[PDB]
Amino acid sequence: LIDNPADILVIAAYFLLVIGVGLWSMCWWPVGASLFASNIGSGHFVGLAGTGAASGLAVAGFEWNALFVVLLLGWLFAPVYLTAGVITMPQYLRKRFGGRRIRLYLSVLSLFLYIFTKISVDMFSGAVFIQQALGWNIYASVIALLGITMIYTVTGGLAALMYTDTVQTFVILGGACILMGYAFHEVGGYSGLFDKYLGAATSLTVSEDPAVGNISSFCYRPRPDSYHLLRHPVTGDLPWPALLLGLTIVSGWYWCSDQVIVQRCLAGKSLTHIKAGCILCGYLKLTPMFLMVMPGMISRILYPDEVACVVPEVCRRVCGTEVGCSNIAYPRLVVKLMPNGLRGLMLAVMLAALMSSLASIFNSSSTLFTMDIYTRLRPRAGDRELLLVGRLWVVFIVVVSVAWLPVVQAAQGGQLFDYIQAVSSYLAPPVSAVFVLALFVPRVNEQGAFWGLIGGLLMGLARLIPEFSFGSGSCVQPSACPAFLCGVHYLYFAIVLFFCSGLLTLTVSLCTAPIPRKHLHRLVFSLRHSKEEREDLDDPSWARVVNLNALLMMAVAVFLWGFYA
């Protein structure tokens, strides 16, 4: 419903200005802004809003545990990425363990998680945004998104992303604030939302498929525990013992092992400015509740027939998939509530962010592949061969991601955030456990760490592969997946995978002798400060102010946690 002069003109103007900015290059605030830019992504918007609409308020605990994991990065992991002289987590692991097997496995795992949790997610979120605006098919939407991403990459926007990212982080937050205000005004305010959400449900809940038959209230009714982050520890959408503990693992893997954030963080003048950037990122990481989760609840309130679709046929007609329209909440909000003038600007900035992220991820994946896999499979290299290989790899990941859109659409009952977190938790906890063990216990050996990593990979695939093979579905058509394999919340499986990988790493490393201290100097957290050389393997008041600010941030975070408990 954007086919009015007020919308197309603004979108075209916005894209033209972005291209011109890209073309021009052809001729505490920053650190925190860059850190939060990952959560500002439109994929994050869609996932969080859809999960909020589907379940309630609990999905914000993910973001606030990410606050507490950022106050773990800044004070525990950044100081070691500065005492080891290393930059990225795989570089720390290579320096500490040596060899090349660990680095090659990490490169392959990073490429897989880029294709699954980032590339496919961004493509699907852009497709959902375009479908909810132009009413297009998912494949046409992703084709258009890919085309505009190509224009972005060739006009040189990835060479001027400085002036299209850290100032787009203010247009996608002003638009988010304005849309939050509009949604709250439409729903009657804070109290209006909290009175109305529990009573918002679909009216078309019968279905004509004999097997489905009548649909139970449990599925089209909002969860009774929809206003509490502390869901039941066993029968809960987000088992709180996992939302806290079993997420700190995955979120630590992200903010301590995701090259984007690790390097954006290490791009600070001092450790007392990296801490301040982390503090500001945390305060800005408390905002996603009010900006995306509760607006998703308002989306469910205003558009139950669409967002709260429960009938398979209605859900196929609305979502495009029969599982559920959870992940169209924010797109529906944007395309319906906001005015005809600013709606186009909001959609343009969202799509520009999605395609900028896609371009950055394509470039990063090409660089990683060329410099870590083909560089070893053919040491001869050659610039022409490397460029051809990079372009062919971009084509390959684009094709595979396009072939993954149905799975992203139907994953975890149609909840994009649940899909992202499941794919993460099924592959991250192993590397997180290996990294933590390497940081803390010096007994870890290189071959032991590699064997632990690969064992965690195998035992996490033993749950990722069958889950996608059998599907997830919803109450209406529950998947025919084994109970013992599928019932356990993916975060509980995250904890189990973390601990199993740790136990395997200890078992393997205890078989052989440890690496001497000459290769551990200034690498272990317990031996950071030694004032001795190594053989390699190939303030007074500002600090107090930063500490007090961190304490204030934690106090605010715990206040909000208790308020929404």
Partner: peptide, 25 residues
């Protein structure tokens, strides 16, 4: 009420932080 739980959590964490500082001392 919810603000009561928020204040309870804030007080609990402040007490824990004070205990940690005392242990450091």
């Amino acid at each position: 009420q919810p603000w009561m739980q928020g204040l309870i959590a804030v007080a609990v964490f402040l007490v824990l932080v004070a205990i940690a500082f005392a242990v450091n001392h």
